[PDB]
Amino acid sequence: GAESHELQDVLEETNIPKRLYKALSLLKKEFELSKLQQRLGREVEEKIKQTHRKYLLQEQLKIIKKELGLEKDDKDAIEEKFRERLKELVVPKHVMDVVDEELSKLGLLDNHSSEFNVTRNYLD
Amino acid sequence: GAESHELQDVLEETNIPKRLYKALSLLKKEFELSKLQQRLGREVEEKIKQTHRKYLLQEQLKIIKKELGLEKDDKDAIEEKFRERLKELVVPKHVMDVVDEELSKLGLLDNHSSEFNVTRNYLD
Amino acid sequence: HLPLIAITRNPVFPRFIKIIEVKNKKLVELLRRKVRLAQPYVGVFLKRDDSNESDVVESLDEIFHTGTFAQIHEMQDLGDKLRMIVMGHRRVHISRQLEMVEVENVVHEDFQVTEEVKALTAEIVKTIRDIIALNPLYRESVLQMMQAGQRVVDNPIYLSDMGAALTGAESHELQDVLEETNIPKRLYKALSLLKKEFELSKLQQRLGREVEEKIKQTHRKYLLQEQLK
């Protein structure tokens, strides 16, 4: 990555050993600069890695939220809509685990299936 | 691709502009029918690809459920839940083989199938 | 002498058009007051950690002393009554926002010998190209319009600022980059932040593409089963 001026200076050298030594010195200087840059980059890497992995987990969670939201249409939020509807319900354990099985199947299934439609009506 | 009746009608036409108009006519009619066919084919292919990608996003949704809500559930599955429920009973063997066959069917039976619900109720 | 603009999670990178839409209508009166002014202007700043709307009106120290003065372009108000357009024109750092007095303390120091300084620019642009290719965020037409070899880059600092603006780094990281006064420090910090944000985003997309690979693998195994079946 030496300069054009450095290349001109290398060319100005006449003797083979002298130009070879100048090229080796330029190699050493460029390598030293690259190592300093890489070490500073690595130090900055650890510095920003001090950011807790909780941030990465939260970003994964947000991505999970930011998935087929349909511009907050509230449609296709069927699972969430039912969960909020059940939120205000002091409800037994049998219906909740049955509903868990059923909506797990719902997620497993595709939207337009007829069996999916029957399950949707039953969940209603 | 016009039918032979259209070709005979064109042949009946004598004026050169008229038969040229009819040739352009059949050309557009074929163009429209084709364009509709290719648009329909590409739409169906895109829908199938989106169905595959919806299986993809459903598996991603399963990863989402994992450790959360439904998929969180409890360690027990229907299989193991009924195994432990029946663990504390001094029980005969014919019922053990019947339960083993029922559990094998349950595993083979998809959870959504009505036969699966019948099997689950019988096992309960 | 104007009240601080409520950023409300609308970061404004240097030399980047951004839209601020604050639900509160109080800013509407301020915007309508400055219309009679021959040269309307808006203050652009950055909020500190733990954003709180009440604190924005209770205390003025929450907003970073750093700001980006700019010229207002035009009202739209298409869907909302507040569609403020904020652009990165003139970076400024107020000594004490409590006490307005302002000075254009823009530090752009550079060395007289300029033959290796632009090499890191080549590395930066190559890295930016790699990130956008592997992590598409914006159209490539901007890169074609702004080519390092075109020689039209009269503001290398602003070019680096935009390239770092592609980074998805938290506003804390952007503030850290801004605090840096030395050009090499800010450039290296921006490069490192860019590669971290690329790491995060590529993990995000790798999860789904790995789902793709898993389902294809199971289908292929079932297809061999199906041949023998």
Side-chain angles (χ1 to χ4, degrees):
Chain A
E3 302 193 349
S4 310
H5 187 53
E6 295 299 344
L7 305 163
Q8 179 68 17
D9 305 3
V10 167
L11 288 166
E12 294 301 328
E13 298 297 348
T14 54
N15 311 104
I16 304 300
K18 294 42 171 173
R19 62 173 50 195
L20 281 167
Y21 181 80
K22 187 170 269 190
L24 194 73
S25 301
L26 275 169
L27 289 168
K28 285 183 204 178
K29 199 171 186 183
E30 292 300 332
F31 172 71
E32 284 168 325
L33 179 63
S34 67
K35 297 298 99 180
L36 169 56
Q37 290 180 338
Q38 191 173 5
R39 287 188 302 94
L40 170 53
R42 176 59 165 77
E43 213 185 4
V44 174
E45 289 156 37
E46 47 185 290
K47 288 178 183 202
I48 292 157
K49 189 191 289 184
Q50 298 291 93
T51 309
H52 295 285
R53 275 62 169 178
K54 293 308 300 169
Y55 294 89
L56 296 155
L57 295 174
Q58 189 215 37
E59 290 165 317
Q60 297 296 114
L61 174 142
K62 294 188 288 290
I63 300 157
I64 292 171
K65 314 311 167 254
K66 312 193 289 289
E67 268 184 359
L68 189 79
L70 292 172
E71 302 97 5
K72 292 83 199 166
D73 61 345
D74 310 299
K75 190 266 189 184
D76 197 4
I78 301 300
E79 183 268 329
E80 183 268 308
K81 184 263 189 188
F82 295 173
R83 189 172 64 77
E84 62 168 7
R85 186 172 197 183
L86 301 150
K87 180 174 73 69
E88 53 263 21
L89 312 184
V90 188
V91 61
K93 183 72 177 62
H94 309 296
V95 62
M96 61 79 71
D97 63 358
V98 166
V99 166
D100 291 328
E101 157 164 1
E102 196 61 56
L103 301 151
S104 46
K105 298 205 280 290
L106 199 76
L108 289 165
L109 269 55
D110 67 311
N111 48 28
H112 182 67
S113 177
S114 167
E115 284 289 342
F116 186 103
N117 295 335
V118 168
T119 305
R120 179 66 179 86
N121 171 279
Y122 187 79
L123 288 170
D124 290 328
Chain B
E3 300 181 0
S4 303
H5 182 57
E6 294 290 346
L7 304 173
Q8 179 64 8
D9 301 331
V10 174
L11 288 165
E12 293 160 1
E13 298 290 351
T14 59
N15 306 117
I16 305 303
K18 282 198 174 177
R19 55 177 47 193
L20 293 163
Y21 299 146
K22 214 160 278 194
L24 180 62
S25 297
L26 305 170
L27 275 159
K28 160 165 194 150
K29 195 176 173 159
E30 298 287 321
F31 182 77
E32 283 180 329
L33 167 55
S34 47
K35 167 177 284 182
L36 165 61
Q37 286 167 212
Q38 294 82 17
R39 289 183 307 92
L40 177 57
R42 65 167 177 71
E43 170 179 353
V44 172
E45 294 298 328
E46 293 179 353
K47 286 169 179 177
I48 299 298
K49 290 293 108 177
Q50 292 152 33
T51 303
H52 172 53
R53 286 189 177 175
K54 287 154 191 168
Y55 294 111
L56 294 175
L57 297 144
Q58 168 278 315
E59 192 283 344
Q60 289 187 277
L61 186 64
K62 158 156 183 176
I63 306 313
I64 291 163
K65 299 308 180 174
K66 284 181 182 183
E67 298 72 61
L68 293 177
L70 283 71
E71 184 60 29
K72 174 243 174 185
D73 206 356
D74 290 340
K75 64 90 176 179
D76 62 354
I78 306 305
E79 180 81 28
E80 195 281 312
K81 189 264 183 189
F82 299 168
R83 285 287 182 179
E84 62 169 11
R85 169 189 215 181
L86 180 44
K87 180 50 60 191
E88 46 270 21
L89 299 176
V90 177
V91 72
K93 296 313 304 183
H94 45 275
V95 287
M96 291 325 98
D97 214 318
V98 171
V99 165
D100 299 326
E101 186 176 1
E102 192 91 341
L103 296 156
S104 54
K105 292 208 290 295
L106 195 76
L108 295 165
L109 267 64
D110 291 331
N111 189 358
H112 211 278
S113 182
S114 168
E115 297 298 339
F116 187 99
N117 294 336
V118 176
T119 317
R120 188 210 298 114
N121 173 280
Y122 180 97
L123 202 45
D124 283 320
Chain C
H1 186 273
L2 58 87
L4 307 177
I5 304 302
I7 294 93
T8 72
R9 71 161 208 298
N10 274 309
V12 190
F13 291 97
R15 294 287 171 176
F16 191 77
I17 302 169
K18 278 296 302 201
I19 314 182
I20 292 172
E21 300 182 4
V22 183
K23 298 179 174 184
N24 306 336
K25 300 180 179 181
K26 301 185 178 181
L27 308 184
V28 181
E29 307 305 344
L30 169 65
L31 291 180
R32 294 341 310 171
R33 276 199 306 274
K34 60 173 82 165
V35 176
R36 61 179 67 271
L37 191 68
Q39 302 293 347
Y41 53 80
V42 61
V44 181
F45 312 90
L46 187 58
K47 70 185 183 308
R48 275 162 220 281
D49 291 332
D50 302 337
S51 187
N52 192 340
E53 295 190 357
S54 73
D55 293 334
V56 169
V57 299
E58 287 166 12
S59 303
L60 304 179
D61 198 1
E62 303 276 349
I63 312 306
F64 283 116
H65 60 85
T66 70
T68 316
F69 193 95
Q71 298 184 2
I72 304 175
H73 303 64
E74 193 52 27
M75 301 325 88
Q76 181 63 69
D77 295 330
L78 184 72
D80 63 358
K81 297 174 180 179
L82 173 48
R83 196 170 181 178
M84 187 66 204
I85 311 175
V86 288
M87 189 57 194
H89 281 104
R90 286 192 292 188
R91 69 182 67 188
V92 64
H93 297 338
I94 311 301
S95 309
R96 290 185 186 173
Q97 61 189 347
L98 190 148
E99 197 270 329
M100 273 75 82
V101 64
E102 63 178 341
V103 62
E104 301 297 340
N105 184 267
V106 182
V107 181
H108 191 229
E109 307 294 346
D110 293 315
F111 300 87
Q112 187 63 14
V113 176
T114 55
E115 191 79 12
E116 272 194 4
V117 298
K118 66 187 187 303
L120 184 63
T121 304
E123 193 178 0
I124 290 163
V125 297
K126 181 267 290 180
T127 308
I128 290 161
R129 184 182 297 189
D130 300 330
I131 303 312
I132 61 184
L134 278 70
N135 184 77
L137 295 167
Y138 299 88
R139 65 211 281 171
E140 299 294 330
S141 75
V142 299
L143 190 149
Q144 303 284 1
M145 183 278 288
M146 157 196 84
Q147 186 58 37
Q150 274 284 335
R151 192 55 179 77
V152 302
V153 185
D154 52 348
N155 303 90
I157 182 167
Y158 278 134
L159 195 145
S160 71
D161 300 338
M162 292 186 285
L166 305 169
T167 66
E170 303 170 358
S171 304
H172 182 74
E173 302 297 345
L174 306 171
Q175 179 64 6
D176 291 331
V177 171
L178 292 166
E179 282 182 0
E180 295 287 356
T181 55
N182 315 118
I183 310 305
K185 290 194 174 178
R186 52 183 60 185
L187 295 166
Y188 305 136
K189 181 67 159 180
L191 191 148
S192 305
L193 280 162
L194 170 68
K195 63 185 185 203
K196 283 132 192 164
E197 292 303 316
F198 176 71
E199 289 159 15
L200 161 60
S201 70
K202 77 173 198 291
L203 173 65
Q204 307 180 355
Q205 292 142 16
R206 270 188 291 117
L207 168 49
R209 294 189 189 177
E210 183 178 1
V211 177
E212 181 46 290
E213 294 293 329
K214 289 188 174 67
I215 295 168
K216 297 292 95 171
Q217 188 276 333
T218 186
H219 188 55
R220 167 187 333 116
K221 191 186 175 289
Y222 182 76
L223 273 187
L224 293 174
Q225 296 156 235
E226 272 297 324
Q227 183 65 40
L228 60 84
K229 272 202 305 300

